[PDB]
């Protein structure tokens, strides 16, 4: 009793080597980088962005403000 129905461990095996190589890579990989990456990047990006309107404006502006600053060009002299 040996090769003859038994085999026993593992014997490296190549296939089941690469297998997990390759699957430890996509999983970790995609998994972790691409899902808290893209994930959390576009979820938080995405409604920081469009929510707090980051990109210029903000609410309103550091500036003394008083009443604006030009309808439409004034002289008051």
């Known amino acids: ?22 699957a ?10 691409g899902g808290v990456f893209f994930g959390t990047l ?6 920081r962005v469009v929510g707090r309107m980051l990109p210029i404006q903000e609410n309103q502006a550091p500036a003394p403000n008083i009443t604006g600053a030009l309808e439409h060009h004034h002289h008051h002299h």
Do not use: S, Y
């Not at 009793?1 to 490296?12: E, G, R, S, Y």
């Open 42 to 47: 576009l979820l938080i990006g995405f409604f």
């Open 1 to 22: 009793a040996d090769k003859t129905i038994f085999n026993d461990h593992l014997n490296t095996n190549p296939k089941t080597n690469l297998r997990l190589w390759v």
């Open 24 to 33: 430890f890579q996509m999983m970790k990989g995609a998994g972790w980088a």
